[PDB]
Design a protein around this nucleic acid. Structure first.
Length: 76
RNA sequence: GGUGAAAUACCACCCUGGCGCGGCUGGGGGCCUAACCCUCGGAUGGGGGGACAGCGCUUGGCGGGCAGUUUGACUGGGGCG
């Protein structure tokens, strides 16, 4: 619960394979956004079920609640 | 707020079902015609078929027409038992 409040985020692929979560506060330091971004990258990459069969990490989108939307490379 | 298993804004990811156009690729129906077959009926040019079917290889399958084997031992015979 501690971190839940302290600095949390969670996983939960919806109906057909999608997750939703935060990885870098609003105006907040770009680099910071980068950090939580990649952090989730991994967290996820890890949770990745052994039952995958092909291009696992699919549609990688970063977008805003009510704002723009576009994919990103969980890599560089 | 309100209603339920669910929130109602706009902006995300993603599925069900159908349309537009764009890469791939499968099916299919049309004369032609130069390879090719037959051609020509008295001439190397005309005629009829024409991408088929001939035909080379690879595929699958009917398949006695054929080939080569086999279809046991005991048991007061063999076999049948």
């Amino acid at each position: 619960i501690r971190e839940i409040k302290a600095g949390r985020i969670e996983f939960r692929n919806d109906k057909t394979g999608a997750i939703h979560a935060p990885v870098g506060k609003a105006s907040f330091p770009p680099e910071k956004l980068a950090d939580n971004i990649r952090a989730f990258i991994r967290a996820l990459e890890a949770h990745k079920p052994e039952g995958a069969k092909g291009t696992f990490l699919r549609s990688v989108y970063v977008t805003t609640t009510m704002g723009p939307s576009v994919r990103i490379n969980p890599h560089s």
